[PDB]
Structures are given as C-alpha cells and as structure tokens.
Amino acid sequence: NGAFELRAAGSSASKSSPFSACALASNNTALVLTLASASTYTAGDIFNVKSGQSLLQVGSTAYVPQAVSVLPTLSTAILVAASVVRVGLPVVSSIPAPYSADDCARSVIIAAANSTAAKAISGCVLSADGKALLVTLGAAYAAGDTVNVRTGQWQLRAGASVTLGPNYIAASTPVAIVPGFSSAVLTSATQVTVQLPLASALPATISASECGDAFDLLDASGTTSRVSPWTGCSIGSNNTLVLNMTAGIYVVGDQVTPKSGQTKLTFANTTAYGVLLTPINPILTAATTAMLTASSTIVVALPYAANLPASTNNGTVCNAAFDLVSAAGASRTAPFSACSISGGTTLTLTIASTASYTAGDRINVKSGNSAFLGSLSASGPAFVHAGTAIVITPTVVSTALISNTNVFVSLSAPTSASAFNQSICNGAFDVSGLATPFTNCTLSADGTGISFLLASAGSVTSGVTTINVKSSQLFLLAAGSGSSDSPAFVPRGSALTISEAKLAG
C-alpha cells in the first residue's frame, strides 16, 4: 500500500490498506495483487503507483506514476438445467433493457472442446440480484464446452446502470462450463431429493465417511457448515441424487452444496459439477399434527418454524398456500377465509361460512406455493409439497351439567351413523372422579351432543370436576361414509370443567 493505490472516480483520497498480499508470478510479469477476502470494487476504479516509490524495481529505473482504469471479466459458469447456464459475475452488472438473442450471441461465445467455433444460443436474461447471467443453450451439452466474452463487446457493463461503468473483456483462458444442482426438496426427517440434468456415477463399494467429504451443509447465511457427515448418498430415477441425513442434523434455512474442486463423481467419467449453494424447501413431515378444535376452525402444529405476510391474512392468502383435500384426493375451493401463525409454530385456519368440513379431509401444502415460508424470516425457503397430507382429528368442545343427575357433552363434528352402541358411554370418555361414571348414554338427532346418565346423583362437583376424551380410544369415530374417512376422536389440549346450568337469580 505504500507504493500502490486504488482510487474511485473523483475520490479526494485513496482507499486505505486495500491490498492484503501483493505478489509476482509468470516470468516476473504478473503482478498478482491479492485483495481482501471481502473487498469491494467501485465502478470505474483507477489504479496507479504512488509518487517516488522504490519497492517495485526494474533495471536501474523505478515505475513512475501513470494511471489506468480497471476492467472486469467473468468469474464462473455452470449448467443449471438441461439448457440453462448460470454464468457468475464478480460485481453487479447489467444489460441494456431490450436484449435479443443476437446481442447475447454478439457478446458471448460457447465453443467446443479444443475448438474456436461458435455454438448458438436461444436467449439470455440477467438475474434478480444482477451478479449472475443466464444463457439458454441451443444444443445438447457435451463435457468440455467452454464460454468466453467476445473481444470488442460493450453491452455488458459492470455497475447498476449501463450508462456508467466499464465493460467485461475476455480472459486469456475461457471459462470451462460444468453442470450443477438444479434444486432440492425435503422428503422426510432424514432425506432430501436433488435434481440434475445429467447422468451420474456411484462410489462402487461406498463408505460412510466419504459422502460428507464430497458435499456440505450450510447455515442460513451460508457461512458456517455443519460438522458431522451423513449416512449415505446414491443415485435414483429422473437423474436424481439422494442424501439421507443423520437424525437432528438439520437446521431451518440450511443450504447444501458440493465442495470446491471435488472429483468424487464425473458425468461421462470426464467432468464433474462444481460448488453451488442450494436452499432446501421444507414440507409438512410426519411430525405435523392437526386437530378440529371446533366445528368451524382447525389447528396445526408446525414441526419447524414458519412465517406469513403480516399476521392475520385475508382469505386469498391462505387459499393460495393451503388445501382442504377430500379423503378421495380431489381439491375443494376456498376452504379458508382467515388463517394466522402465532409464535411461528402454531397455525390456525378457519373454514369459511361458504365452506364446510367433511370426514376424512386432509391438510396439505398447495402446489405452486408462494407465501408460506419455512423460516421466521420474511425471505426464506418456502414449503412445496403435493404428497402425504395430515389426518385432522376431532375432539370435544363444551361440557355442562344439565342437572344433578345428568351430564352433557358437545362435539366438533357429527357421528350420526348407527355405529353408536352402549360401549361409547364408558369407553370413549374419562372423568377423574370415577372409573365408570355413567350407566347409559344417548345421542342427539344431529350427532353433535351426547347425554350421559350418571351412576350416582351429584357425583359431579360443579366447578371442580374435569371431563376429557380417553387417549387412543377406538369406539367413537367421525361420521364417515367408510373406514377410510372416519378418523377417531382425540383428547383436547386442556380438560373441560363441568359447570351446572341453572337460573342464577
């Protein structure tokens, strides 16, 4: 820094200590100035050498000031889909609004291995953040295809706006294209599916310790990587790769990627994919439980953390993310008009007035979900799931003592079938003052209540007693049309207290 400098356009002072370790290479002709690991460039940066220096010497002379302007070049190139190529860039860039496939073919060349001929492209579009560029290949991919920036190209300029910045120029060595991950989805507590536009190879007699040595697991920001490896890694149908993980070795928002320079796999035995940090889209695993707390509302216990826009939602937001699937598989319309997440772990929805519940329904995440995120952050890995849905299980709601010789309970769904027999009187409910509190029981016309005759008049102590549904009982089943859609009733979260119903005064 005492001999060199790096100044911005119009800056009255030079950047302080920008160079971490300046070096020389080639035939003493390549001044490789290593910058900071997280340095920053500024549009149209200017290099120069401070006045009257002596550190860098040549013959008996010393380099004297004369300023130059820095220009950018490419950084990386991946094949993300069968016909899409994600070229990385070092700094933000831009292309001039209307940008045809001719212009991209004008300013980038993909040539065959050990060749300098051009390969056609269908079109190109910048990325969202601007640090990447996406190219559509007009032909099949073969290992060895390379890309470079064409000399004299000027439409591709670093900086946020084209009207102010330098232009990328060709690197001496074209950037070799290698493929990479397309996406990845959570499939269970200890699995994940990965999509590749490739073929692939297995490590013969695989070993437990090696799967980790290839790929990696990243935290939310992508800085830290989890310690222990995972149990297996293989190949599957639809050109996929399976990564079965160790128990509890997942953290919400974590990404996954192969490690720099790995050679454990090779497409066509001659080229392998490089590093790319890839999110993981969660789903409603088998730990998710649902319950019909009342005849017009649901509750779901999210296994991981989540988040929604604002905190109350109108109808269309919940509809666009969630489904009420029949027991047969079909999809019903506008089941939900208001949902919310409280605590980022409890999801409560509300079947609308025009909607209603039927036995055997299930709650599953919508295909094409775009609003229900799998992190406490407003921007994170969204749920995407179209497979197994959650059962939903009804329970009791309200209870009251009709008189000193009768108890009454109300339900959140009908059971108006004929299955009701006397065993439900003493088998489906528990009162914590007697093992067999009742002697007889009868249903209502609409199946939304039961009246139990007690064994001893007044054995219920109004205000103190508690009545709740027995766990893992099989006598009382929802009013379904068959065995496939009659989920069994389950206990409330908190036991209900019986209060006598009488004229206060």
């Binding site: 356009a9 119009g10 102010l164």
Partner: protein, 505 residues
C-alpha cells in the same frame, strides 16, 4: 476562542479538542491568570458568578427532504415520542423575522437508534415556508442529556434556521462551455452577482479528484427558476467530472433574497453528463446532431442501434416512425450524421432528443465515457440555409427556403444575413425582406460588393429569421450557396448583333 455579537449580547465561542466531547453536568469557570479575554480590562476570577453549569441545545437542523427535517443533537438523548403533543412539547417552530405562525406544522417525530438525530415530518410540503426556524420550549421537561437522571435541554437565546439541501440534483452539460444544475424549488441569487459570488457557491472537479479552482465567470437563473446556469470562458469538460455546492454558500437560496436560506451542499456529488445542444438539418435528407464534446458510437452503427438513441417527433409531439436509413459518426467527433429515407420525413418544427438509458452514444469512448442523457425540453431542429440562392440582380439575391417561414419586423439585417468571399472575408449587407408567399427571401447586398464566386450565409447569433411557428430559427451552412447568375434581358441594339444583360462578369 473568539467573540461574536448579536442582539442578545456578546458571546464567547469556545472549542474542545476532537478527542474530548461534552458531557452532562460539566461547568465552565474563569481560570486564575487570564489575560487575553478583556472587556474594558481583563477578567477577574474566584467569584461565585464566574462558575456556571453547562446545559444542552441541539447541534443543527436541516431539511433533508420535501417534508423531512433532521435535527442533530449535542449528545445522546433520552426522549420518548408517541404523538403530536410530544413533538409540540419540545420543538417550537417560527418564521423569518422572529414572526409567529398561527398553527404548528408538525405531524410526528422519531428518535434515531443511537439517540443523536430526530427526524421531523411536516403535515405537507407547503408547511415549510422559507426562512423558518426551530428551538426548544421554555422549561420542557421531556428531553434529557444524561439519561433519565440527567439535565433537560434549554431554550437558546436565538432560533436556529433550517438549512435545505438540493435533493434530486442532476448536473448536465448544455454547451461546450456551459452547465446546468437544477434545484428542488424556486431559488434566488443576490441581485449584484459577480464571479467571486459564483465561485464561492459552486465547485468543480476532474476525474482524478483534484479541485479545478475558479472556472465560473458568471451564473444566472433558469427560466423555471429552479436551477443555476454556470458558464466558462473555454471548454474543460472530461469524462468523470462532478459538481456540488461548496461549504460556504451564501448566494443560492430558497425563496426571496431578503428572507430565504442559503442551500447546503448535497450529500453526494453529481457527475456531469452530455446531451444534445443543437440539431442542424444540413440538407433535405440529413440531420447533423451538434455535439458539445468528443463522442463515440458503436463500432458498427446499424439502423436498429441508431434507432435506440434518437426520437423524431412532430411539432405537436407525435413520434415519427420511418426515418433512419443509416447513421455515421462524423470525422471531427463533434457531430452525428443520420441520413433519411426521403426528403419528406422532416416537416416544419419537428424535434429531436436522446433516448434514456441507452449505451451507444457516449463521451470520448464507447467503453468508459458516460452516455448522453435526455434534455428537459426536447431540442428543436433548426433548418440550415442550404436551399437554392440564385442571383437575381447585382444588388438583390433570392433565396428559396423550402418551408413555410416568417421574418421579424423592423429587425436589423446586419444580424441576420451576410456574404462570404475568398478566405472567409465577410461583407456588409444593406437591407433584407421576406415575401408574401412565405418562402422567398430577398437580400439587399451593397452595390458591386458581390463578385462572381462568393457565397451567401447566415449571421451567427441571428434571431430574426424563423419558420412559420415563430420559434425555430435558421442557422449558417458549411458552404452557403454558390450563387448563380440570372440574365435580365437584351435590348434592341441593331438588326444583327444583340447584347445580353449578363448579371455579373
């Protein structure tokens, strides 16, 4: 330290070193042995009146936005703001000349996270009348310096003006030697402006970041009175220039001169940008865009690429579609020649301008020079005098201007038309007129001053000759017209030999 005086009395302006800021509860006492600070004679010491506790006021107050005022504080502050009542409890507004406003202009307040700046939002942008002040209220008990247990703020003997910045300031280049610099509102300058005031107000810098020093001979006001125009004797422009208000502004102000506030300097400097200064249609199918600097075009300039960088437009403001046949950048790098499909694609009054966010036309290089930018008001297409000019008589010349035109009444012909001989030597003209047909123009040259070979032209700076609309004015041409001879007649001299009245030698 130094002593300054105002209406409330004489004050001492004491300074602390940058390493020791002020803390709540400190006190200032006259030191034994003082000799420098004198009234009639030096100050004594040791009396109980020499020691005084120090109490806080606010550091500054600025108008960051049309409805935003930022007040920096002399220390970390413990204040609680919740409603308009709190804002009116601490801060009282006022007007220029110590006058009092009938209603408060405040809406809500907001303390910064670090407690060193409070934003103040007005009800509307019309509430901030020019020359308004701010202060603290008598015995306000809310704001504190030193936590809850510290000491409150205090009123200051004088109110503090709010200094406005030029938010939304863009500096563009109109001519080779002139630059505009627009301001956020109706502004003003001292009536008797001189170069000292001009150069005390604005600053200029080159690409390297070194101060240009005193370029501005004069400056004036824009027609919409929302900006300043600055002029220079000779061109200096380069790619990478910037501009800003200096830190000692006392000339550019918000509102009336006698009551306004001088502008602060902008937060960020405003790089200069070139535009189109004039459009001289040099022949019936060729338009030359006069340029104010060295310009660079695409290495190959096609009809599509040149149609990304102009806008032809009728007088009423309707874009014209089929115009461009080719565009070639001129040798001098100060003009652009756009050829036309036919002589009809231009009508009287039509106008031209640059298309925004284009990357072709740039300043001195297609790589790093900034591209041109659109003009606030599109440019008029001046018709250069290139139509036929045929010598009708030894004293009168005829010019068949192709378009409908009108000419000023009573204007001095010497400022409109001229005649050029060999070597560029101009010649005087006597009179001039325009015909009833609205096209033909007659030039009354002095007798015998014209010699076969000379060419007619248009005086620089002329404003008398205009098209029908009365707002477009003619301009000189490169070669004028090689005025041709027209014979008058022949006389009945004799039966065998006739003499023909050839107009010139």
């Amino acid at each position: 330290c130094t002593v300054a005086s105002d209406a409330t009395g004489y004050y001492l302006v004491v300074t602390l070193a940058a390493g020791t800021p002020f803390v709540s509860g400190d006190e200032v006492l006259i030191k034994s042995g003082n000799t420098a600070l004198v009234g009639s004679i030096a100050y004594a010491s040791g009396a109980a009146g020499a020691t005084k506790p120090i109490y806080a006021n606010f550091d500054d107050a600025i108008l960051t936005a049309p409805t935003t005022v930022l007040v920096t504080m002399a220390a970390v502050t413990t204040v609680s703001f919740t409603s308009k009542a709190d804002c009116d409890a601490v801060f009282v507004f006022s007007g220029a000349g110590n006058t009092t406003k009938t209603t408060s202009p405040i809406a809500s307040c907001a303390l910064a996270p670090d407690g060193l700046s409070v934003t103040i939002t007005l009800s509307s942008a019309d509430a901030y009348v020019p020359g308004d002040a701010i202060n603290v209220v008598k015995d306000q008990t809310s704001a504190k310096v030193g936590g809850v247990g510290g000491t409150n703020l205090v009123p200051y003997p004088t109110a503090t003006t709010i200094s406005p910045r030029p938010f939304g300031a863009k500096a563009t280049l109109v001519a080779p030697t002139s630059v505009a610099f627009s301001l956020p509102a109706v502004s003003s300058l001292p009536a008797a402006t001189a170069a000292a005031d001009c150069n005390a107000a604005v600053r200029y810098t080159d690409v390297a970041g070194v101060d240009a020093v005193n370029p501005f001979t004069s400056c004036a006001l824009t027609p919409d009175t929302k900006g300043v125009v600055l002029n220079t004797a000779s061109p200096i422009y380069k790619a990478g220039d910037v501009m800003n208000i200096k830190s000692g502004n006392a000339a550019v102000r918000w509102g009336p001169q006698a009551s306004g506030a001088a502008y602060y300097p902008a937060a960020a400097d405003v790089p200069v940008f070139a535009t189109v200064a004039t459009a001289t249609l040099v022949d019936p199918s060729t338009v030359v865009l006069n340029l104010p600097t060295v310009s660079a075009i695409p290495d190959n300039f096609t009809v599509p690429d040149c149609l990304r960088a102009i806008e032809f437009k009728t007088a009423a403001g309707v874009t014209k579609n089929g115009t461009v046949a080719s565009c070639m950048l001129m040798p001098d790098r100060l003009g652009l020649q756009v050829k036309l499909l036919s002589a009809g694609n231009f009508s009287a009054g039509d106008t031209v301008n640059i298309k925004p966010e284009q990357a072709e036309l740039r300043s001195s290089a297609l790589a790093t020079g900034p591209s041109y930018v659109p003009k606030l008001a599109a440019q008029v297409v001046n018709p250069a005098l290139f139509a036929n000019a045929n010598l009708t008589s030894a004293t009168a010349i005829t010019v068949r201007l192709p378009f409908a035109s009108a000419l000023a009444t009573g204007a001095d012909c010497k400022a409109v038309l001229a005649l050029l001989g060999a070597g560029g030597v101009a010649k005087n003209v006597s009179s001039c007129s325009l015909g009833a047909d609205g096209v033909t123009l007659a030039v009354t040259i002095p007798a015998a001053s014209f010699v076969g070979g000379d060419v007619l032209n248009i005086v620089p700076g002329q404003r008398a000759l205009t098209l029908a609309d009365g707002t477009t004015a003619y301009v000189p041409s490169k070669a004028g017209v090689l005025v041709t001879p027209n014979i008058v007649s022949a006389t009945l001299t004799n039966a065998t030999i006739v003499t023909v009245a050839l107009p010139t030698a």
